[PDB]
Structure 1
Amino acid sequence: MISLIAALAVDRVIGMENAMPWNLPADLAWFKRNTLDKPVIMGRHTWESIGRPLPGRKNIILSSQPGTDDRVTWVKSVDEAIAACGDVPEIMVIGGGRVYEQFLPKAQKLYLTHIDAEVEGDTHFPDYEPDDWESVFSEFHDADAQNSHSYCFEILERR
């Protein structure tokens, strides 16, 4: 199966500049815990934001264009992408906008972070449709020294 993993602020907001309008080390920890030892599909811009491969996972980039880092696996099509993983149980699609927009239809599971914050952004998360999904997990957490905002992790299964 394929899985999307995102952190949404208010209004399904996923970013500004080519940045995340928040800083939540504990979300990343959760991100990391969910992906580790699994293939992660990103897009040229997301990749540019990360800025270096992710240890313990096969990092695949989406560029129509030629790759500029030998450390990671480059791809020019979704099919390529899906191909570049091979035979694994779960492949993780890590955005951004456009990539998400294209993978939702193929996804079977979501791992979302509902950040409690109203910030303005330029990239929004694909419009999933409630009736299709089954929220099968939730965990709440309050702002703290580290995490300026509370957030709720959730997990949904394409019904």
Structure 2
Amino acid sequence: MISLIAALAVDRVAGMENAMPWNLPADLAWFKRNTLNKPVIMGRHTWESIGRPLPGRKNIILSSQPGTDDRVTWVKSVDEAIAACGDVPEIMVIGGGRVYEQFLPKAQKLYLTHIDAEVEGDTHFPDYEPDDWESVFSEFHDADAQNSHSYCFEILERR
């Protein structure tokens, strides 16, 4: 199956010109936890933002051009990306906006972190219809000494 994972501020804002204005180590731990040992598909901008291969995962980067880093796998279409993942239980799509919109119709599961941050950005998570998804897990966390905002983890499965 194909899954998306993302951190969403209010209005599904997912990305800005620069790094998001929050310190959320617990969310990064959730991200690692749910992606380790699985192929991860990302767009070139997200690859550049991360700045290195994510360890312990097969990193697959979408770009229309040949790759510029031989440590990771580079593909030029959604179907090539999927094929490059091989026979695995779960493919993780980790963004960014362009990539999320392409994969959402193919996806069976969403891993979302809802962040109580009323911020502005240039990249959003695609619209999804709550009636087409069953929420199977939810977990709230307040802001604390190590996390700048309150965050709520959710897992949704497509009906």
Taking structure 1 as the reference length, what is the TM-score of the superposition?
A: 0.98
User: Which deviations, in whole Å up to 9, do the C-alpha atoms of 1:88-141 show, x marking residues without a partner?
Assistant: 000000010000000000000000000011011000110011110000100110
Deviation of 1:66 after TM superposition, in Å, equals 1.4
CA distance in 1, matches of 2:71, 2:23: 27
Q: Is the contact made by 1:18 and 1:45 (CA closer than 8 Å) also made in structure 2?
A: no
User: Which deviations, in whole Å up to 9, do the C-alpha atoms of 1:60-110 show, x marking residues without a partner?
Assistant: 000001111111000000010001110000000001000000000000000
CA distance in 2, matches of 1:158, 1:68: 36
Q: Is the contact made by 1:15 and 1:21 (CA closer than 8 Å) also made in structure 2?
A: no
Taking structure 2 as the reference length, what is the TM-score of the superposition?
A: 0.98
* % identical equivalent positions: 99
Q: Is the contact made by 1:16 and 1:120 (CA closer than 8 Å) also made in structure 2?
A: yes
CA distance in 1, matches of 2:79, 2:118: 36
CA distance in 2, matches of 1:22, 1:64: 31
Tell me which residue corresponds to 1:148.
Answer: 148
Greater Cα offset, 145-154 or 15-24: 15-24
Deviation of 1:18 after TM superposition, in Å, equals 4.5
Deviation of 1:23 after TM superposition, in Å, equals 2.0
Root-mean-square deviation (CA), in Å?
0.7
Q: Is the contact made by 1:18 and 1:46 (CA closer than 8 Å) also made in structure 2?
A: no
Tell me which residue corresponds to 1:7.
Answer: 7
Any stretches of 5+ residues in structure 1 without a counterpart?
Answer: none
User: Which deviations, in whole Å up to 9, do the C-alpha atoms of 1:17-62 show, x marking residues without a partner?
Assistant: 0432322111010000000000000000000000000110000000
Any stretches of 5+ residues in structure 2 without a counterpart?
Answer: none
